[PDB]
């Protein structure tokens, strides 16, 4: 016969929305995908597709702390399949963190209450989607860099909730920018910086 097995199995995911893209583009062949947790009863999900991508979210979100393993079986199109395994995936430690967003902000006395949007995630506890903060808890610090337009030298403030109460100078322009950091991690620890935004 002749039907090529797979290569380039990549886990791609932001906020737990996980998809497995791979190669090569099917040349007169269909792939079927099997996903299991860490070493176990495999569960087929993407039946004899021709796409080189499989959205396995429903699976990974059942337990973001587990390390999933997967494989792609190559079946011959038209009138013992070959398979290649995916790398391990541990949702809680490798999903990229989507770019943050300052949700709003209004002065609370001699200070400026700043706030980050509590993003929603595919993670579903009970019949509910938990937020980013619902999933990570205190294991999610937001780093705010702010600085006054006037100068080039910045300032920083940390928070492990969603708002900051930063004092600022009376009648001055201050731009802001904030980054998400999961401290627990050893690799995808940070997100991209949220679009800078300024005051008056």
């Amino acid at each position, epitope marked *: 016969t002749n039907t090529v097995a797979a290569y380039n199995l990549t886990w791609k995911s932001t906020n737990f929305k996980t998809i497995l893209e791979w190669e090569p583009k099917p040349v007169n062949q269909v792939y079927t995908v099997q996903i299991s947790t860490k070493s176990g009863d495999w569960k087929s999900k993407c039946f004899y597709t021709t796409d080189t991508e499989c959205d396995l979210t429903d699976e990974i979100v059942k337990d973001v702390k587990q390390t999933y393993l997967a494989r792609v079986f190559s079946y011959p199109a038209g009138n013992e399949p070959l398979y290649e395994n995916s790398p391990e995936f541990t949702p809680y430690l490798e999903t990229n963190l989507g770019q943050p967003t300052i949700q709003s902000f209004e002065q609370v006395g001699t200070k400026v209450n700043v706030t980050v949007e509590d993003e929603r995630t595919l993670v579903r506890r009970n019949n509910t989607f938990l937020s980013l903060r619902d999933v990570f808890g205190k294991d999610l610090i937001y780093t705010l860099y702010y600085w006054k337009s006037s100068s080039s030298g910045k*300032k920083t*403030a940390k928070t492990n909730t969603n708002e900051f109460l930063i004092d600022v100078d009376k009648g001055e322009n201050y731009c802001f920018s904030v980054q998400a950091v999961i401290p627990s991690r050893t690799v995808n*620890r940070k997100s991209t910086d949220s679009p800078v935004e300024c005051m008056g």
Partner: antibody
Amino acid sequence: EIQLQQSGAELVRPGALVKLSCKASGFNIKDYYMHWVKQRPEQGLEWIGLIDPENGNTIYDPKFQGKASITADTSSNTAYLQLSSLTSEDTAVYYCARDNSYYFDYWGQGTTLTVSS
Amino acid sequence: DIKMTQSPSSMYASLGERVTITCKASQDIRKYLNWYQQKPWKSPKTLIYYATSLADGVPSRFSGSGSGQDYSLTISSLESDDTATYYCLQHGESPYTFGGGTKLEINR
């Protein structure tokens, strides 16, 4: 596994400028915030400044602005700290640390800068 | 800008004794207080972080309490390798400030 390396010793002539370095090993500095902490003889620790190797941002204690400048080469996984307009008052030991957000969880051994002729 | 005030500068105590070093910040730091131990000729070690969490293999006799402006590290049963210098470092917002530190000398 993880580790930060520093020059150990360094004698410098007053007025000159110097660039201590701190090489990172077993972690990527673009995932953390590198710090620099000075410490003079009969005195306690003093924060110099930080740097976010990621989106090249740096923060400085007021007291050092102009006197210092933390730089990082994300290729060679190295953070820097260049002092300037040197006076005897710069003679101290420089540590570079690693901030995981909750605390400085790795310290390079110290560099012992001596400004003299 | 945001000052830390650690007390006492030095303090002699005997083994098995309990000791309390203290740090007061001039404004709610929101438990972004860390206690550091420095043995002579040694990079500092991180004893307690986030006001009350024990860290990287710290002995259970170390503990810290705090909220807002009041923070304190306490060693229950003082021992030999506690002769060191302790610093509190607030790292809630720039600039990051270490307190003045205190030197525990063991009485024996």
